[PDB]
Amino acid sequence: NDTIASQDTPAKVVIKANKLKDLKDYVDDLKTYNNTYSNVVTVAGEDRIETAIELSSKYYNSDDKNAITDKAVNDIVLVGSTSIVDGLVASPLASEKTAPLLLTSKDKLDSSVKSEIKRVMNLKSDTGINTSKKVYLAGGVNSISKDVENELKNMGLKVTRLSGEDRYETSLAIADEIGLDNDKAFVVGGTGLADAMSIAPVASQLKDGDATPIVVVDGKAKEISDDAKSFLGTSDVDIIGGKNSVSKEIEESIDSATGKTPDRISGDDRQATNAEVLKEDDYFTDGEVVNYFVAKDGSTKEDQLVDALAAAPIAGRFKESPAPIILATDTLSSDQNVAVSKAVPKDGGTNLVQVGKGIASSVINKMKDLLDM
Amino acid sequence: NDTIASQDTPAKVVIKANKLKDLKDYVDDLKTYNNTYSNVVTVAGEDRIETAIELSSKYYNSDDKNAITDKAVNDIVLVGSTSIVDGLVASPLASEKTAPLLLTSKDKLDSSVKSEIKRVMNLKSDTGINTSKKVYLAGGVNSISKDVENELKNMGLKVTRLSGEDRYETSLAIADEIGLDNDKAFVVGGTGLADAMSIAPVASQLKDGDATPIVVVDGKAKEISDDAKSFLGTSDVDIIGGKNSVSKEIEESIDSATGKTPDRISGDDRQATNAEVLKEDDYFTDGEVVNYFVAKDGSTKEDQLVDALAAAPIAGRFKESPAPIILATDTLSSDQNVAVSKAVPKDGGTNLVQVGKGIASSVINKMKDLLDM
Amino acid sequence: ATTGTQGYTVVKNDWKKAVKQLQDGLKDNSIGKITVSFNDGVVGEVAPKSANKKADRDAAAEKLYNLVNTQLDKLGDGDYVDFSVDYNLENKIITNQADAEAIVTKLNSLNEKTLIDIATKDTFGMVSKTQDSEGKNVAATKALKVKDVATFGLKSGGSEDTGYVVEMKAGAVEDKYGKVGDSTAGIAINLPSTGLEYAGKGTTIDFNKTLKVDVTGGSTPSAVAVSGFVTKDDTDLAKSGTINVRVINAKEESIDIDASSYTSAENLAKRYVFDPDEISEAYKAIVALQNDGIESNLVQLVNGKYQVIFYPEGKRLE
Amino acid sequence: ATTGTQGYTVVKNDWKKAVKQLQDGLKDNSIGKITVSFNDGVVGEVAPKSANKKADRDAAAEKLYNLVNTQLDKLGDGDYVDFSVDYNLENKIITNQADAEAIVTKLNSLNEKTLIDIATKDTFGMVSKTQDSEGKNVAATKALKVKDVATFGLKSGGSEDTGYVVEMKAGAVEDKYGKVGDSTAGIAINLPSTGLEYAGKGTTIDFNKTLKVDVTGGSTPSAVAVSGFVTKDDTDLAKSGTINVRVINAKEESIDIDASSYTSAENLAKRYVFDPDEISEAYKAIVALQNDGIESNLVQLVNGKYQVIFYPEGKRLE
């Protein structure tokens, strides 16, 4: 009626009760609190830049239990910290390249970021930086200036810039690098920032190594661009967002070009659209989604969606079960609550990762309830 | 007349010359600059506390080429950042225990230090802190307060305090933990702080796992303490420092107690004594010392010898060839210049580690010349 | 001996009682040999030179204590002492004469307990040996008590070397079994002829079965018998084998949920990290026991309270 | 090819000339086969169907270019192309009739060069075949020039298929070797009977040894000979074997120490990290060559300049 304990154990815990039911309840709570203090992690710094670094340090070149890689990486994806628009579709790139998505100030490369780059890639004075060490700049000069690009080159790294004359051309530059190999692509409107962040984790899900590209299109135009049409070829397209993000005209345009009827995952607002991504069976299976990420929705400010941008690749590759990102600053929507409820198994969730500061307590609490944590 | 180059090589460097001698000179300079930008490291932060952390992060639980250990450690040695006197003889303890020597503020455990402790010991929320994780506090309450000791206990670490009513009793507490197992001990005067730092690397040299203890004695007293006599037993003693640090009376006292004639390694000043430690054949072999550490001498301020304190264990265990510490803030002494000259082989030095900020450039340059770097 | 094994884990504070039990075991001849280890290394071996000699068993017990008392008493963190205990319950004896007399007085405390009541017209009981003038049974003077059935006391020829033996001697009863006013002759009361001895060979007297009446026939009784000593195995554990005991430098944490003040499950999680599989398996064993009839090693009834045991990995950070 | 093995490393910028040399090698029949690899994977094999046919050799050369020209021209970072070259210099031929005639005219430009001067009383030279009335040697009419020794021109039966061959035909000389006024008879001049052909079998004509006079005897000469074609190996490398060539996407850094402006050793160290053992071995090879005359593969004389090659690990941080 006993086992021989390890010599290093700090205590012998004997939990007694007259009633087996009172014991049951205690041991249940113990389990919950044990798992919760173990699997309910917050990954945040004081800045948006620090949050991205925290993500990189935890998940890339890390001994952490849920790390994407334990060895040094060969690729970085860098995004302008303010410019959510330029790097909007960079998450699937970061995923495919086995790279952290880091944020930098536009003018000067942040010393914090420089340090993390050295750490994650294992760059040292005594060791040569061979041509396999690569840094992708997602955005033009207005998001990541030439000054920063030259500073990265000066340290001895190969620097490829994925950019165009506008957000649309820039997205195609990024999407082109990712490649449309699995006959599937995601399309988002120019202003549909939260929508791109809802789908980013899904796009970041790798199948035989390849991520799925996201393309930004002019949602109020008569037609999409020749470049978009050429890139999209004859692939299945899922439009993320409502008519106000990507019009009826654009849907037809994509229909005509591809010759295949595009799907539409959308809601009345950003939180509804986020819920729909989770509810969509193609992206997630009912009662088989255990790992979850939470980040701000960008209702207060749009550029605060960069937390989700940095997190999305990790969410896509997380453990052995891809995770969505729930978008919520102050409050979860009714649609989200439902979505998670149907997504999570009977047993409940096994991982919850809050990304960034300023996410209200009710939100995490609600998530913990829904996941039984 | 050629080799098949690696695919990842950034260039093919062809160095040509009409005169073989001009080539010789170029390739010689190349070698020097190549080794120097590789093996002449500075390890310093903005604070004394940060310098110690930098040392820990570089050499303990590190993938660095010259790291003391690549896995997580089980022991920390903590010292009050201002109190050089209390932790004076802690370096050989840190060495024997395979521990970094960290510095903390007396009242509040520094967040920087707390973070490094977690990193170096690999402490995590999801993993249990078993009873093998130990933190030694070298000093009484006036160097490291109860507040800090309780804060370390609260994190889940075993905390043993090595202290006494004064510096002398505290040294014996530390020396007692190290153990006088190899029938040998070092003795330094109460005011001989620089002398203790000169010998600390030597004391930190392990032989069959064991370091050699250092004991502080009242240098102007008629006799050493009963506790010192009891600890020292019948062992060989090497006194470090001149008459003004440890009197003739004390030498006799140690002679009488041990029954063995104590040696004396000393000079007219601290820099001379430092040189003598290097010149002493028992501690270092002529033309076989290639690795060198440099730190401030404490002439400007005595407490600035904490850099040497933190470095000394690493110096003792460095690579496969123990290193001394040269004590010099603004200038090397004539004795030091000579000492290194005789110490270094014909080939020159292979490693130079500057520890801390305010070491003058002439000093490092002189060292680089003496070591042919 | 080894961390995952079946065996006992004694905390430091209780080392004295644990060693005393091993000493008692050596004295009463339960334990043939104890191999002692300080951490991973075997340091000593305790065994009486001849089990049949009392002095040799006491010598073994003294040596055992002398060896380990300082190591256990001053046990540091991470240190532990393992005892591999070769035992054999069939060799166990009652080596103290005071212990044998303690059983005799335990038996004597039942002397006044009524086994069979005096008979009535409705209910069967004790009747007289001879019937009335009409040829019907009449009630007995007194009820049948334990004092009427047998006397107790230790047998002659016992010793500390070989062991003592509590003995039961059958009495005599003239009164018989029947109903008052019944024509059928009272049935003779069969007194204990067997199970008259008890040596205590790793077994204890089952008082539910010892000196109990056994009426045979049901509605029409034909025979009445009173049992002698009926024993029971004092443990579920095997008669012979080897047992591993380990002392560790850990504090015992008593969490009584029924108490006025106890450590909440939250604060317990805050203080220690538990192995998830250790908990989940314990929880599943509780749920299974609650919902179905399924008993488990993980959950057990001890001292009128259901309990689980956890040896956490270590303390939790912060 | 494999990293660190013996073989050639061509930078991207020079891929065109490298492939042209392989093409020329295929055309002139030096190269029997080339196995091509894009990165680690073998993608193609170039070889003429029959080496004796010109068309087949040209076809091989065209195929080689067609295969690799896009891969090499657009070579990305980390990518490389390896050529395993089965060669045999003995099979090498002169495929152009213009090249053969260029050698003939090169030989014909020596026709007026005097090999042996007319004899004097002091110095040995050319004398007449018959002595004067008194029985002493008399000076020859003309000196011995190259035109007197042999005529040049390409041999009949040559073709682009099999190859052309420059031929030397020995002349005739009546005049002999001696001193004027000497009684001993003039020594017969041995004209070239061997080395009359040159096909260019991986060799070039050594003009220091070709058509040179070889007087035997010293103070008292006994024999005089004029050599035919004496060749020299155009490269130090073996006649037959297999060689590995690798193109990489790296920039070439020419560091000429004799130039007005070059990269200082400091700035070079600042820009790249070098393998310490790669340098030390190179330095030791230079010192050894400087002090002791010991030659090495690591340091070599090329175009009147001593050179070393370094392939650094990568660029240096900061």
JSON list of C-alpha atoms in Angstrom, two decimals, chain A residues 1-31 33-35 37-38, chain C residues 1 3 5 7 9 78 80 244 246 250-251 253 255 257-258 263-266 268-269 272 274 283 290 300 304-312 316:
[
{"chain": "A", "resi": 1, "resn": "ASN", "atom": "CA", "xyz": [0.00, 0.00, 0.00]},
{"chain": "A", "resi": 2, "resn": "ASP", "atom": "CA", "xyz": [2.97, 2.34, -0.63]},
{"chain": "A", "resi": 3, "resn": "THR", "atom": "CA", "xyz": [5.86, 3.02, -3.04]},
{"chain": "A", "resi": 4, "resn": "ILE", "atom": "CA", "xyz": [9.56, 3.79, -2.39]},
{"chain": "A", "resi": 5, "resn": "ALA", "atom": "CA", "xyz": [9.87, 7.56, -2.92]},
{"chain": "A", "resi": 6, "resn": "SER", "atom": "CA", "xyz": [12.76, 9.36, -4.61]},
{"chain": "A", "resi": 7, "resn": "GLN", "atom": "CA", "xyz": [15.45, 10.61, -2.21]},
{"chain": "A", "resi": 8, "resn": "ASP", "atom": "CA", "xyz": [15.10, 14.13, -3.68]},
{"chain": "A", "resi": 9, "resn": "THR", "atom": "CA", "xyz": [11.35, 14.55, -2.92]},
{"chain": "A", "resi": 10, "resn": "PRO", "atom": "CA", "xyz": [10.67, 17.61, -0.67]},
{"chain": "A", "resi": 11, "resn": "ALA", "atom": "CA", "xyz": [7.59, 16.13, 1.04]},
{"chain": "A", "resi": 12, "resn": "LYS", "atom": "CA", "xyz": [5.37, 13.09, 1.57]},
{"chain": "A", "resi": 13, "resn": "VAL", "atom": "CA", "xyz": [1.86, 14.34, 0.76]},
{"chain": "A", "resi": 14, "resn": "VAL", "atom": "CA", "xyz": [-0.97, 12.37, 2.41]},
{"chain": "A", "resi": 15, "resn": "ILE", "atom": "CA", "xyz": [-4.43, 13.76, 1.60]},
{"chain": "A", "resi": 16, "resn": "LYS", "atom": "CA", "xyz": [-7.15, 12.32, 3.86]},
{"chain": "A", "resi": 17, "resn": "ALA", "atom": "CA", "xyz": [-10.96, 12.56, 3.92]},
{"chain": "A", "resi": 18, "resn": "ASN", "atom": "CA", "xyz": [-13.89, 10.83, 5.66]},
{"chain": "A", "resi": 19, "resn": "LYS", "atom": "CA", "xyz": [-15.93, 11.10, 2.44]},
{"chain": "A", "resi": 20, "resn": "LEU", "atom": "CA", "xyz": [-14.48, 9.83, -0.86]},
{"chain": "A", "resi": 21, "resn": "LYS", "atom": "CA", "xyz": [-16.40, 12.67, -2.60]},
{"chain": "A", "resi": 22, "resn": "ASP", "atom": "CA", "xyz": [-14.61, 15.41, -0.60]},
{"chain": "A", "resi": 23, "resn": "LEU", "atom": "CA", "xyz": [-11.31, 13.74, -1.56]},
{"chain": "A", "resi": 24, "resn": "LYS", "atom": "CA", "xyz": [-12.40, 13.49, -5.19]},
{"chain": "A", "resi": 25, "resn": "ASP", "atom": "CA", "xyz": [-13.10, 17.26, -5.26]},
{"chain": "A", "resi": 26, "resn": "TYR", "atom": "CA", "xyz": [-9.77, 18.14, -3.63]},
{"chain": "A", "resi": 27, "resn": "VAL", "atom": "CA", "xyz": [-7.71, 15.94, -5.99]},
{"chain": "A", "resi": 28, "resn": "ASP", "atom": "CA", "xyz": [-9.64, 17.39, -8.96]},
{"chain": "A", "resi": 29, "resn": "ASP", "atom": "CA", "xyz": [-8.76, 20.97, -7.92]},
{"chain": "A", "resi": 30, "resn": "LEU", "atom": "CA", "xyz": [-5.15, 19.88, -7.30]},
{"chain": "A", "resi": 31, "resn": "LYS", "atom": "CA", "xyz": [-4.95, 18.51, -10.87]},
{"chain": "A", "resi": 33, "resn": "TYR", "atom": "CA", "xyz": [-4.13, 24.06, -10.34]},
{"chain": "A", "resi": 34, "resn": "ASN", "atom": "CA", "xyz": [-1.13, 21.79, -11.04]},
{"chain": "A", "resi": 35, "resn": "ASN", "atom": "CA", "xyz": [-1.75, 21.81, -14.81]},
{"chain": "A", "resi": 37, "resn": "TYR", "atom": "CA", "xyz": [0.51, 26.69, -13.03]},
{"chain": "A", "resi": 38, "resn": "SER", "atom": "CA", "xyz": [2.31, 24.48, -15.62]},
{"chain": "C", "resi": 1, "resn": "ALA", "atom": "CA", "xyz": [16.14, -0.31, -2.58]},
{"chain": "C", "resi": 3, "resn": "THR", "atom": "CA", "xyz": [12.72, 4.24, -6.46]},
{"chain": "C", "resi": 5, "resn": "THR", "atom": "CA", "xyz": [9.54, -0.48, -6.31]},
{"chain": "C", "resi": 7, "resn": "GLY", "atom": "CA", "xyz": [7.84, -0.87, -0.39]},
{"chain": "C", "resi": 9, "resn": "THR", "atom": "CA", "xyz": [8.77, 5.24, 2.58]},
{"chain": "C", "resi": 78, "resn": "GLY", "atom": "CA", "xyz": [19.19, 14.00, -0.63]},
{"chain": "C", "resi": 80, "resn": "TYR", "atom": "CA", "xyz": [18.53, 8.10, 2.52]},
{"chain": "C", "resi": 244, "resn": "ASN", "atom": "CA", "xyz": [12.18, -2.77, 1.05]},
{"chain": "C", "resi": 246, "resn": "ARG", "atom": "CA", "xyz": [13.46, 3.61, 2.76]},
{"chain": "C", "resi": 250, "resn": "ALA", "atom": "CA", "xyz": [11.41, 14.90, 3.62]},
{"chain": "C", "resi": 251, "resn": "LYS", "atom": "CA", "xyz": [8.74, 16.42, 5.87]},
{"chain": "C", "resi": 253, "resn": "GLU", "atom": "CA", "xyz": [2.40, 16.92, 5.03]},
{"chain": "C", "resi": 255, "resn": "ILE", "atom": "CA", "xyz": [-3.83, 17.25, 4.58]},
{"chain": "C", "resi": 257, "resn": "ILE", "atom": "CA", "xyz": [-9.98, 17.92, 4.42]},
{"chain": "C", "resi": 258, "resn": "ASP", "atom": "CA", "xyz": [-12.33, 17.34, 7.39]},
{"chain": "C", "resi": 263, "resn": "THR", "atom": "CA", "xyz": [-3.89, 23.46, 2.97]},
{"chain": "C", "resi": 264, "resn": "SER", "atom": "CA", "xyz": [-6.19, 24.26, 0.05]},
{"chain": "C", "resi": 265, "resn": "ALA", "atom": "CA", "xyz": [-5.56, 22.36, -3.20]},
{"chain": "C", "resi": 266, "resn": "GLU", "atom": "CA", "xyz": [-4.51, 25.72, -4.71]},
{"chain": "C", "resi": 268, "resn": "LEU", "atom": "CA", "xyz": [-0.62, 22.89, -2.36]},
{"chain": "C", "resi": 269, "resn": "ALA", "atom": "CA", "xyz": [-0.16, 23.27, -6.14]},
{"chain": "C", "resi": 272, "resn": "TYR", "atom": "CA", "xyz": [4.90, 21.78, -5.05]},
{"chain": "C", "resi": 274, "resn": "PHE", "atom": "CA", "xyz": [3.30, 17.14, -9.00]},
{"chain": "C", "resi": 283, "resn": "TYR", "atom": "CA", "xyz": [-7.96, 10.90, -9.78]},
{"chain": "C", "resi": 290, "resn": "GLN", "atom": "CA", "xyz": [-16.80, 6.39, -6.69]},
{"chain": "C", "resi": 300, "resn": "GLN", "atom": "CA", "xyz": [-7.08, 3.29, 0.07]},
{"chain": "C", "resi": 304, "resn": "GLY", "atom": "CA", "xyz": [-11.66, 5.57, 8.58]},
{"chain": "C", "resi": 305, "resn": "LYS", "atom": "CA", "xyz": [-10.38, 7.96, 5.88]},
{"chain": "C", "resi": 306, "resn": "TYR", "atom": "CA", "xyz": [-9.79, 7.60, 2.13]},
{"chain": "C", "resi": 307, "resn": "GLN", "atom": "CA", "xyz": [-6.26, 8.71, 1.20]},
{"chain": "C", "resi": 308, "resn": "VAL", "atom": "CA", "xyz": [-3.86, 9.16, -1.70]},
{"chain": "C", "resi": 309, "resn": "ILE", "atom": "CA", "xyz": [-0.06, 9.51, -1.47]},
{"chain": "C", "resi": 310, "resn": "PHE", "atom": "CA", "xyz": [2.00, 11.96, -3.54]},
{"chain": "C", "resi": 311, "resn": "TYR", "atom": "CA", "xyz": [5.79, 12.35, -3.64]},
{"chain": "C", "resi": 312, "resn": "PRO", "atom": "CA", "xyz": [6.10, 15.58, -5.72]},
{"chain": "C", "resi": 316, "resn": "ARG", "atom": "CA", "xyz": [7.36, 25.19, -7.39]}
]
